[PDB]
Every structure is written in C-alpha cells, then in structure tokens.
Design a protein around this nucleic acid. Structure first.
Lengths: 245, 242, 302, 297, 56
RNA sequence: UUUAGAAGGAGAAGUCAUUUAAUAAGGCCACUGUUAAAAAGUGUACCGCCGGAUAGGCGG
C-alpha cells in the first residue's frame, strides 16, 4: 500500500463524444473518470487487486470533425444513419494524456503490462484507442511533456458580476479567453430504487441531469500543485460529483 | 412539448412520455450550476436513453441521463449577441423535430451552441500531421554495392551517403520535443537485422537525419558506420545543420 | 426462456480506422510518398475536388483494423439464462466449425480490394498489401479476384482467416491489421475520396474529407466493403452477387430489402435460442456474421 | 418516375496546364506561365495572363481516359431498368459498337476545339499524341472546319477504332494523352479559365491557377468535346452544333431548342418502358447522353 | 600553431594560424599559459597542480 | 462498468465582356561599445617474411 501515479502518454482518440450537453469540443470529464473506473474494474477482474482514485487531464491536440464555413464558425460532420434521420451529434479527434493517482500495493515495474493488455478493450468517451504512445511510472513533479492541463478554476465561476450563473457565466467569459465551459459531474433527482428497464436490474436507478462549471489551461512548466489538479470523485446525499479540492 | 427534461433528444426510437419537470429552485452561488441555477425562461423506467454507472464510494448506481433543452434554447439567445467563440450545429431537419414533438426544439432545431476549444496553437494541420511522419532512404533494400553484410565496407560511396543525407529533410526542422523517441527495441533490431548476436564492438549505429528534420527507428532507417565515417559525418551534417 | 432481454448490446468485432490518401508512382512505391491535398475549383459554385499531381501515377491508402472476440465483447446483458444460452451456442459453433467459413470470406473481401470503390474502375494494376504487427505477408493483385466468385482455397487467405478465427473464437484477446494499397490509375487523373454530411445554410457544393489536409475515407465506408459477404440470402441464384450483412438486409443500393422474410436476424434468433432446431449451416453462418458486426439487440419494448 | 438512378461519365479528362514554347525548338522547350496582376481603372484588382517577349507558342497537355458504359453504371435501384439498359446497349453494339460517336469525338480533339478564345487568331495549330513509347503522326488542325466532320483519315480512323473497340470489347480503361501547340505571335494575350469568386467588395478577374502556373478547367475542355449534336431538329436552318445535354439548348442562345421533342425528361417514358423502335439519330442522342451520364431520376 | 577554428567547412582538414604572412600562436593560449598559477583551490592535496584562474 | 453499445454521402455542370489613377513634397540635430575567453583528441594507419586458405602468427 503505497501512493503513486501512472501516466498514459499521448493517447489519440477518434470520434470521441464531444457533444455532451452544451459543450462542443472538450467532452464531459465523467467520461474520463468512468474510463479510469472501467480500467480499475478490468484490473480487479484479474487478481492484481489494484485501486485507482484520482485523474488529471493533459490536452495536447484537438480536431473538431469539420471545417470553417465563411468567417470562422465551424460546421461538423457525421456518419450516415441506418437501420434501427439524424438529430444531434458531434465527434472530435483528441490527442490527450492521463495522470492517474494510483493507490495500491505492488506497483513498481508492475501492472503496466496488465494495463496495456486491458486497455485494448476500452473506449474513451466512445472512441477508438488506436495507439497510445507510452505508459510511464516516473514519480516526479516535472514528469509532464509540453501539454496543457485542464483544471478546476473556481475564481470567475464563483466571484463575478451578475446575479446568477446565467447572468454571470457569459460576463465572466468575455474578459478571459482561456477559461472554457466544462461539464462536471451530474445529479438531478431522488427515488434510488429498483424500477425495471435497467441496464443492470440489481443496482440503484435514478433520473439524473448534467451540471456545469468552468475550467482553464496551464502549461507543464508553470504550475501550482498536484493537489490543484488530479480530479477526484465525491459523493453526497444524491449529489454525486467530481471536483478538485 | 415544453418541459425542461424531455426524452427523444439525445437519441430516438424510445416510446415514452418521459418528462421530469422542475419544481425545485435552488439558485445559490455554489461551485456549479444546473437547469434550476440557469435563467430558466421555460418519469418511470428507461429504454434507449443513456445509462451510466457511478461509484457512490461503496456500491454503484445506475443513472439515466436526461437533457437540458431549456438551457439549449437559452444558450442560443445568450450567445446571439455575445462575443466569445461559438459553434453552429446544423445537423437536423424539420421532419425529425415534427416526429419528436417538441415545440422548444422546433424553434431552435439549428442551435448556436456553447463550445470549449483548446487554444488555437493546439489545433492540428498539415504540418502537425507531417511532423509525426519521418522519412526513409530511397535505396536501402539489400546488399547492393560496397557492402558485404549491412555495414558500409568499401569506399567511393560516402558521397552517395552524404547526398542521401541531403536531398531529404531540408528546411523542415521540428522542435526538440517534436522528435522521434529512441526505443528499447533497437537491441533486438541489431539482433535480427542480419544475424548478429549482439551489438558489435567494432561497429556503431547511425541514421541519415540524426535527431534533425525527420528520421525514425524503422526496420530500415539505420546504417551502421565506421569510426572515420561517423567522425566525418558528425561535422558534415552540422555543416548544413548548423 | 421466452424473449430477448430488455437491454442487449454488442461491441463490434472489426473496428477499422479512417484512412488517409497519399500519391506515389509504381516504381517508387515503398520509397517515397507525397501528401495529397484537397484543392478547389470553379463550377457552374464552390466545389471541393481532388486530383493527383502531374508527376505521379498511383495513389496510396493506409488503414488499420482491430479485432476483438465476440464472446468477450458483450457490453450489456440484463439476463443470465440468455447469456449462458448464447455462450453455449458460441462454444458449440466453435466446436463444430471454428469461425473459419466467415473469416475466409472476411479476408476474401480485402483480397479483392473492394474498399476502393470508385477508385477501382479504370485502374491498371493493384498491389494490396496486408501486414500484421509481427508478421509480414506477400502481396496480391486485386484484378485476379472476381467481385462475386469467392476464393476458399488460397494460402494467405487461409492463414490470415485462421489467425483471425482464433481471436473470433476467444483464443486471443485482440488483433491489429495494417493494410496499404497502391491502385494505379494514370498520370494526373482524378481520385475519389469520401464526402462528408456537413449541411450548410448558404453553401451548396460538395466538401470532401479533409483529415488534416491530406484526403481520406471514412471508417464507415471502408468497413462496408469488408463485410459484404452475404451470399446466403433467399433467391441468391437469381441475383449472383453478394450483399452486405445487416438485420433486415436493407442495402441502400436497391431499396427493396434482400432478406426481410423469416430468413433474417430477429426471426433466426427467435428460431435458435427458443426453438433450438437444426437450422442449416448457412443460417448459422449469417447469425454469427451479424453477431460479429454487433449493435443494439434489445427486445422491442413499447 | 423511378427511384435513385445515376451514372458516371465514361470519358474523363484532366485539367490542362499551360506552358510556353518557341516553334523552332518546340519538342525540347518548355517554360512556365504565371498569372500576372495589374489593377484597372473604381477600386478593383484584376488578374491578366500574357506571354513573355522571347517565345512564340502556347502549349496544352491533357489526357483522356475511357471506360465502358456497363462498367460506368453507378447507382442501380431496380434490376428491370438495369437489364433494359443492358439489352438496349447490346442491340446498339451488335452492329457498329458506338462507332458513330467515337469518330466524331476523335475528330473534335483533332481540330483543337478546346481553346475557346485562343483559336481567335492563329497561324498554325498542331496536335500531338505521345502516350506510349510510340509516337503518333502529327496533326494539322487548321485544315478542319467546325460544321463538317471528315470521315476518311488514317490516324483519326485508327484512334477512333481503338476507342470504339475499347468502348465495349477489349479491356476496361484506355488512356490517350494529347499535346497541342498554337502559334499566336509574340508576347500576346492568352486566355486561361476564370474562377468563380465568392467575396464581397471585389469585382475580380481571378484566372485559373493549376499547379501554380496557368491552367484550363476540366468542365471547359469537356464542353468542347461534347458539342457533337448534329441530329437535333431545326438543324438545317440554324446550322450550328450544340453541346449535348439533358435539356434542349445551351446557355449561349437562351431560348430552349428541344424542350419536348427529344429530351431525357420526355422521351425516356416511351423508350425504356415501351421499348419501341426509334430512328438511329435518337439512339445516337440517347447513348450520347449515357456517355455523359448524370442523375436520371 | 593553434588552428583558426571551424571557420569555413570547404576544407575539412585542419587549418593553421596565418597572419602577416607567417604562422605563430594565438595569444589567448599564452594568456591561459601565464594565468595557470592558482594553488589555492579546495582539495589541493588530491590533485596537486596549478589551474588557470577562472571564474569557477 | 465512460450521454456505453450502431451507421454507405453520392452522381452532373461554360463564369464572361470591355476599362488612362495622377498632379505636389526639406527627416532632422546630438549622443565613448566595452570588459573576457583552450581547437585538438595520436590527423594518420609500412614492409621482410613463415604460411600457398586473402586462415592465422615473429621481427624491423
């Protein structure tokens, strides 16, 4: 039982779901959190017994699946619908990297082969893995290549002019260009019982809606803390969420 | 119709009247926002709606995700006059919205939507696709001339090697972090290139564009050299790659 | 058991990536390789078109395939009896055939290089090369293979079909295939890349697939020619050409469904798990063929 | 009318690239021709192309590629239509095999009609075909007229026999590459194609840049070769050929010429379904349209 | 004499010093010859030679 | 166990015509570039032989 962190370096994904609710481009972070949880479950199916809790995102390159129409606005592309008309979807080519806060025994020069074997049956936000560049276990603060980290900056999200989120989001968005909208977890309702029609009937069912906040990009050289990134799960009385504290 | 949480928006072919509405208004300045925290000017079983799993610290909970179509209508009019970047989405026809049966979606079936682009020096292009592709020599196939088994043996061919180092990879230099890595497969490459048991003591390893303007660790992009030849080309390549 | 589960989902077992185009000659194929940018033209309109340079003769297309087992790739099943029943059926099919009669045709498709659709007509010579990440394979000429007469007695076809049938059975867990092709058209002729579904308020031209400038093809189209081996549909003896594999047989070329009768997917699953009758080998071939492609196989609740 | 039916064009042309030579060393000389720019008097920038002062001949390089009509049948939504098209094409090729139109196509290359304005004022025009290692005999395009078609040559008959036999019989593709030389003078004004601009506050004259230098459109070099429609009614009075199209008349005259009498929106209801016998000029028009292709629904 | 560095790589061979129609020596070499008198560095007994008086 | 699981964009085209931009014009005046340095790794590698396989070994 020792604390460490693994790095998934330069994972490029085609057709990742970039149309979560309102944000076109960067997907919801719960996609990456559930990807880390699916990797944790895949390693738990094997008898390695290794836990993962904490994930930070480092974006390198992005390609919205489209072009520019006249002046700079984007028009996006889509496949042809078939056997069961198109309604609303978008896709992206991401080239980003993962920091996974890894907590569990027997990590040094181990579990990398298991992660490599179990990664091939995984999709990041519904997109193909293709070829990630490397898996690394270097335990330094300056172990990051030249990328940009998407963190939770609750400064203009919290303190800005405007009475409420709506009359405050766009007003906090004019003066800062790096700051971007981010879907951050999701909670709506109650009645956690066992109503039918579930994907797995032996679980807890709910009717849940996405929630939103702000985010920002900082380089690998200039930074504040590891604790200012590496997003964590959190749970309350029906208010499941992901945050950095 | 006009409810905030209506189905048949993220997908289709889901026969249901799933409307959750909103009788709760908690509009405090928290660290987040929801459909009730917004401006907001305007539920049993599930099939063909997105279902996810979330850990509660202990077990897992299966959660069905409903859209925020009132926020989808409000973002369009908020972004109509705003100056931050925005991405249009013309991925719809009128008959699909008529079949779906939502009056709010019918007025805004081609919405002006929020977006989150990473900064504009991160978007890929032709140079950002050609930097990951590295050149190859146009002659190295087998023992052609001046060569017994891989190594450049005879003389009067190092001008040919110097013009193969030229004529490819000129003016297209990349930064240091935009360079191909040196993998650990290379020891097995010297093992099974021609039949060597290990790295020869009497030979070295070299490429034709070493760490400058292309070059990768392929199965053919290495040419082993002698001491004098490598010593000469270390300055010969730096003569034009100053 | 009486009915299909309320939520059944299958992952696709043949995940292809999008391809990208490059222009090269036929005497300098593996040697050098130029980017094929999408240029623009005047039409009487703003029409995007692509063509080779005046100093090139062929074009080059590279794309990759990933193979996952059908047994393991069950993403969501809301039952245990149905899961064990189809598991037993899959083990029975492995024991009796070994998933080889499907894989031979799945590699017959790439043997004739059907993934270059309008690029095939008028071409001079083809050099489709298939490479796995550990083993290289000999090339073949796509003009010697008919588009209807399949080959079930080749060598490279048999080897690759067996090596992918082990993954289909469940012996391995993944497979990666890299394919390169060198269709020879002529000097400064026209190539035919893919075209997007980007609607526009003002524009009325055709925009082709950019993909960082260097043109290419969608993975949806490049997969469609690798699963067009259905010759077991009814009245096949009056048509003499294969069709792609779907549920209802609704090929977009014709508009009349090829197999909408009881020889289908729903009405064969209703006759396989529940009935457990000795349906012939072609029906089982089709059933595991559509189960390889996968999708959403939930029962029709209302 | 039936479901989605379409076609592909059976003859294909590249985009010709302009050059500039001198007629003394016309085999061994080749110089590029870049589109200049000079403003004209009103705020407006316009481009113009002209030769240099030390040369004398314009050069055009373009190649043709032919496929069979059976191999060019693209979108088939019904097999009754497809087998009717097959039967009509085989009863056409049972006796001549597209021999009427291929000869006129090869003649239309042979006059060098593809230069729309560069033929206005020329001393000598020659046409060379050198696709294989063998060299075809050189041409004399100044000894031809627009209205009449010649039928008794050697190289025209040989090449027309080659395309008319590859149209149905031997092989699927065939490529023939042609090079043309026009003597217009010294440092004169040459006319490449024009580009459809789409920006406001600019009355530009953006000419066509192919591979940087001057060039020619593909739809314009395929509009001169498609002008052979000397079978339409009211031809003896007007006495000029018209480009072949699904409607009646081109945009040159404005008024329609064949809106009802012979047009693919009208006669195909009484051709593909009734299969009644038609005169050979109507069949020539129908397979001229099926040579061009396009949507037919 | 001390060579004239890698000025122009037209001649790959080692050049020499040429000024006023003769050879000689760079006087930076003479300067670093006369500057080698420092025997006050740390761990003098381990190495035991003079070192040129440089910044470090 | 990730707004998870799935998907054929297609065929066809004529952008064309002419056009004078030009008259007039003062870049100015003054401010020390200096401090200090390692190009040279050994800069070229021959015979007498025994050996008759161009194996391999002694001496100058």
């Amino acid at each position: 039982m020792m604390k460490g962190y693994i790095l998934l370096e330069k994972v490029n994904i085609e057709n990742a779901n970039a149309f979560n609710n309102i944000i076109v481009g960067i997907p919801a972070i719960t996609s990456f959190l559930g990807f880390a949880r699916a990797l944790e479950r895949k390693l738990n199916a094997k008898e390695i017994a290794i836990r993962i809790n904490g994930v930070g995102l480092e974006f390198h390159e992005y390609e919205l699946k489209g072009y520019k129409n006249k002046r700079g606005q984007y028009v996006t592309s889509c496949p042809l619908p078939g056997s069961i008309h198109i309604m609303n979807q978008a896709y992206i080519d991401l080239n980003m990297s993962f920091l996974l806060e890894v907590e569990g025994p027997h990590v040094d020069m181990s579990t990398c082969k298991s992660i490599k074997s179990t990664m091939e049956t995984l999709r990041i936000a519904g997109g193909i893995i293709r070829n990630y560049k490397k898996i690394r276990l270097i335990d330094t603060l300056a172990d990051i290549p030249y990328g940009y980290f998407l963190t939770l900056r609750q400064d203009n999200l919290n303190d800005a002019a405007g009475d409420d989120m709506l009359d405050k989001m766009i007003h906090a968005l004019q003066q800062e260009d790096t700051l971007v909208p981010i879907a951050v977890g999701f909670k709506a309702l109650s009645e956690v019982g066992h109503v039918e029609g579930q994907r797995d009937p032996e679980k807890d069912h709910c009717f849940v809606e996405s929630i939103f906040s702000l985010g920002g990009f900082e380089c690998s050289k200039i930074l504040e803390d590891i604790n200012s990134c590496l997003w964590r799960y959190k749970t309350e009385e029906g208010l499941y969420l992901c945050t950095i504290i | 119709h006009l409810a905030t949480h209506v189905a048949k928006f993220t997908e289709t072919n889901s026969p249901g009247n799933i409307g959750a509405y909103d009788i709760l208004s908690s509009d405090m300045n928290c660290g987040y926002l929801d459909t009730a925290n917004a401006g907001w000017k305007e539920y049993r079983t599930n099939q063909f709606i997105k279902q996810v799993f979330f850990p509660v610290g202990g077990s897992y909970h299966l959660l069905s995700i409903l859209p925020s179509t009132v926020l989808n209508y409000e973002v369009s009019d908020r972004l109509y006059r705003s100056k931050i970047p925005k991405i249009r989405l013309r991925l719809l026809s009128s008959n699909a919205a008529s079949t779906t049966g939502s009056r709010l979606v019918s007025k805004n079936k081609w919405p002006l939507v929020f977006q989150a682009l990473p900064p504009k020096f991160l978007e890929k292009n032709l140079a950002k696709a050609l930097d990951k592709e590295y050149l190859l020599p146009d002659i190295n196939i087998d023992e052609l001339e001046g060569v017994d088994n891989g190594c450049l043996i005879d003389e009067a061919l190092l001008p040919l090697i110097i013009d193969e180092g030229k004529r490819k990879g000129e003016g297209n230099y990349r930064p240091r972090h935009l360079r191909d890595e040196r993998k650990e497969e290379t020891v097995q490459a010297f093992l099974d290139k021609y039949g060597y048991c290990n790295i020869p003591v009497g030979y070295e390893v070299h490429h034709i564009v070493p760490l400058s303007q292309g070059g990768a660790d392929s199965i053919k992009n290495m040419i082993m050299l002698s001491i004098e030849h490598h010593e000469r080309v270390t300055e010969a390549h730096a003569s034009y790659f100053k | 058991l009486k009915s299909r589960p309320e939520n059944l989902s299958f992952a696709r077992c043949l995940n292809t990536t999008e391809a990208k185009f490059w222009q090269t000659d036929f005497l300098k194929r593996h040697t050098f390789k130029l980017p094929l940018l999408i240029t623009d033209k005047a039409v009487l309109q703003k029409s995007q078109s692509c063509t080779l340079s005046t100093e090139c003769d062929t074009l080059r297309i590279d794309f990759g395939i990933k193979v996952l087992p059908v047994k393991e790739s069950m993403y969501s099943c809301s039952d245990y009896n149905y899961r064990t029943a189809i598991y037993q059926k899959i083990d029975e099919y492995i024991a009796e055939d070994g998933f080889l009669t499907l894989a031979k045709r799945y590699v017959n498709n790439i043997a004739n290089a059907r993934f270059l659709w309008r690029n095939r007509k008028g071409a001079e010579i083809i050099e489709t090369i298939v490479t796995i990440e550990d083993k290289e394979y000999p090339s073949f000429n796509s003009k010697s293979f008919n588009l209807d007469t399949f080959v079930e007695d080749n060598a490279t076809i048999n080897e690759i079909a067996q090596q992918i049938a082990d993954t289909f059975a469940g012996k391995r867990e993944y497979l990666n295939i890299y394919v390169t092709c060198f269709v020879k058209i002529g000097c400064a002729m026209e190539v035919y890349p893919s075209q997007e579904m980007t609607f526009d308020d003002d524009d009325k031209g055709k925009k082709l697939f950019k993909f960082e400038g260097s043109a290419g093809m969608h993975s949806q189209k490049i997969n469609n020619a690798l699963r067009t081996i259905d010759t077991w549909y009814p009245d096949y003896t009056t048509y003499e050409f294969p069709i792609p594999v779907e549920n209802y047989g609704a090929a977009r070329s014709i508009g009349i469904p090829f197999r909408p009768d009881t020889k289908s997917f729903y009405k064969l699953i209703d006759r396989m798990i529940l009935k457990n009758e000795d349906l012939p080998i072609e029906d089982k071939h089709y059933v595991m063929a559509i189960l390889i492609r996968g999708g959403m196989f939930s029962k029709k609740q209302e």
